Design a protein around this ligand. Structure first.
Ligand code: 2HH
Ligand code: 2HH
Lengths: 469, 469
């Protein structure tokens, strides 16, 4: 079973002996520190609150096991057993911590406070930064959701330019990163952060997380279609790629089907196998059930352009109202290899260059969507800004001489709306002057209880694009 | 509860309809495909076998829950309920799958077979690639342990060059990546992969994983020392950093203590505070309990050099047998900011340039050790190479025309020792000819049971450096 006493950075175990004596309060905050990615999607905190932080998290057995581990881990008896006993006795293992946070899904610019953490009991001053490590890990669902949303803007910009609308926008970027993530739990968290912006996913784990921790009125927040992998094709034999294609498109004739065709020669399959041999099986398919050709190798941009040109001369192409070329509705293309935010831009710009509408293309990202993200990307940091010693509250902060970009904020923080509708974080407890609006931060966790929740439907509404509004 | 039926890629649910009819066997393998990092550390498979694959992994409830989700996920009823009921009824939920693998800890060059997967029942041909996604996720503990071991080589190369020995080599790279990872499960897996090569860790979660899934004769596989964070320093006020330093070095006067000093001015803390104001507290410290100054900002190389040069002219410096400068035993340094495999090389080379010994320095790595890694780095892949249809077995493979580096192996594979004592992967069942030795791959999983295990002590022995041997 998970033990929160074993879920922190090792050196934090020795931090209760390092704070100034007579300290009754430790007040820390979280931010995507300033110095692309100018605005971030706040999401994932609620998951951590329910799974790891809420309820009775401290027992007699967990204190003992922690004491035994740290005894050997440090070769010394540095462990605030007395501090963890106080929480067990006076609060029945419930954490005396108050967490205020901006509503999940909210798109806040860089350099703003996203959530604040403080203790509600003067004895548990050390508890504030004990749970830093576990709260910092919300950087990942924030980063995934933010980067997925930035890719959505690119998709939206080019789709509108070449088609005239945003039809099927939330199905332009599919999640392939189940096998590409570091762990099972990661896949669930990551896929759920992608579903904030899109509806297409293959990481099944992300569905159960949302249903349990957030919830949707629809049965599921994500969907998928029958598709093929290289094994289901190559197992027929190198001389039976046509038999493989025909068997698959017939098994799924009334539903959308994606077939990978780069097993031996992607350009041969499209022109000869799809475009001649099995051309009769494609032109008969319904609009609601087209064939989706999936290339998986070569230069991403160059392959897509070459695939389209091949299909263009083997299938009746129409020029849309915007002047861009569109395949017949029974044939689409999905690029699911080596696609991140950088190459996504390069591809759709290349398609616009060759007068190809974005209607023709769908994208699949794996490690680039879920794994190729760090905490340095959005500068997600957790710092202390306020403490009270001897009954005197002082404003604390870090300010390295060689790096102004690592400077922290001072005093009690509060998020507000500017007169121009933008955001502003007030420092030094200036929010109590009420020269601005009400503090946007709502208490979501207090004394071991989740005090405010958000459904996944609310998060989707909050994280909408401006072009969609 | 974990559901293996919900732990696969979405499109893999529809794959049982796509294989050629009368398919009795699906035989797939795993490799760190060819075309630095020329040899990889095999590790993490045993964890996935025990936690996810072994025992009764199929129940009536899990089959129903999977059916209900996939029904809504696909808006249709494509789900091999008959296939998952066969396993439940005939094998009591136990997976009829045989997995052969190279002993964990083994350092195998790129392009070799690490493990193989096949079905032991002709009815469960579709089962081999269903569990691809979960077995592929072993890329992470492999990639971490490999990249960690590569950094160990660099440390060993310079430490030996500048000290004459390798004393304390396994404490030169400390894990800080608990807050830098995507999830809790990741933190445990990653830290355990780093502990294969080092003993310095702050990610507590990794210890419980090893004890449960691998085990060591020593109480714990990892260790840590009392250290300070920015909050435990700044809380004293900006005008009382000296009082902060003094209080911490006194609380831990008999044990090694690491104190961060980049809060306001790193170069002032070393020369004025450590080097003048509190110099008397440092020179009295034991050799087994020194002060470890920790910078955390500015250019990693430039900061370390300047810090060392400062400490050089405030504290008595000795010159070892190798001619490299050495701090007194009661004074050491640890750089734990922006340290990956690339910058690590830059720092130690810079230290050798300025006649500084590696004995003086230790390194802390967070996101670079546990997060800044993808499945692309080592080209970890899982492809089918052999199937049996209509009684006849055929050697299958993929071979993209535009990318020769994605070509897969053919037929039944086996790993052997070359006459020169190196590794080689035999294809097309040439291993049965027995022109080489016996197959080095051991059966580690069969019909739901773990048939072979390795302790973390064996894995550590197998992952030793050639310089250590
Ligand atoms: C295009 N498509 N539609 C449904 C599923 C897929 C697909 O290709 N998925 C996928 C996931 C992970 C790795 N490879 C392919
Ligand atoms: C230098 N040191 N010695 C023991 C622990 C640490 C340390 O600074 N750890 C750490 C962990 C995570 C983030 N930041 C620092």
């Amino acid at each position: 079973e998970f033990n929160i006493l074993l879920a922190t950075d090792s050196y934090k175990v020795t931090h209760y002996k390092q704070y100034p004596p007579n300290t009754s309060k430790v007040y820390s905050y979280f931010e995507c520190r300033e110095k692309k990615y100018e605005e971030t999607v706040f999401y994932g905190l609620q998951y951590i609150l329910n799974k790891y932080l809420k309820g009775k998290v401290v027992t007699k057995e967990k204190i003992q096991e922690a004491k035994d581990v740290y005894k050997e881990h440090f070769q010394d008896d540095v462990f605030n057993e007395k501090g963890w006993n106080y929480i067990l006795e006076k609060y029945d293992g419930h954490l005396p911590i108050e967490i205020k946070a901006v509503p999940e899904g909210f798109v806040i610019p860089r350099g703003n406070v996203l959530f604040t953490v403080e203790n509600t009991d003067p004895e548990c001053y050390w508890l504030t930064n004990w749970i830093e490590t576990i709260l910092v890990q919300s950087w990942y669902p924030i980063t995934v959701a933010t980067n997925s949303r930035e890719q959505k803007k690119i998709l939206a910009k080019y789709l509108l330019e070449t088609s005239g609308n945003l039809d099927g926008l939330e199905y332009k970027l599919h999640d392939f990163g189940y096998r590409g993530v570091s762990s099972q739990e990661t896949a669930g968290i990551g896929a759920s952060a992608h579903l904030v912006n899109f509806k297409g996913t293959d990481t099944v784990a992300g569905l159960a997380l949302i249903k349990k921790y957030y919830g949707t009125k629809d049965p599921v927040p994500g969907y998928s279609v029958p598709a093929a992998e290289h094994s289901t094709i190559t197992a027929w034999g190198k001389d039976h790629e046509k038999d493989a294609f025909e068997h698959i498109v017939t098994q799924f004739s009334s539903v959308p089907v994606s077939v990978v065709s780069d097993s031996y020669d992607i350009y041969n399959a499209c022109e000869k196998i799809w475009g001649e041999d099995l051309r009769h099986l494609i032109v008969s398919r319904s609009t609601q059930a087209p064939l989706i050709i999936r290339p998986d190798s070569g230069n991403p941009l160059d392959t897509v352009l070459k695939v389209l040109e091949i299909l263009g001369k083997k299938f009746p192409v129409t020029e849309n109202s915007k002047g861009y070329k569109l395949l017949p509705p029974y044939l689409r293309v999905i690029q699911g290899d080596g696609v991140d935010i950088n190459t996504l831009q390069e591809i759709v710009e290349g398609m616009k260059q060759k007068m190809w509408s974005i209607e023709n293309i769908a994208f699949g990202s794996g490690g680039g969507l879920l794994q190729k993200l760090t905490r340095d990307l959005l500068n997600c940091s957790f710092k202390c800004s306020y403490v009270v010693t001897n009954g005197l509250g002082i404003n604390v902060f870090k300010d390295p001489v060689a790096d102004p970009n690592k400077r922290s904020k001072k005093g009690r923080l509060s998020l507000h709306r500017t007169p121009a509708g933008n955001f502003v974080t007030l420092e030094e407890g200036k929010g109590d002057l009420e020269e601005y609006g009400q503090d946007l931060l709502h208490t979501v966790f207090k004394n071991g209880k989740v005090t405010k929740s958000y459904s996944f439907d609310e998060i989707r509404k909050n994280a909408q694009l401006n072009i969609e509004l």
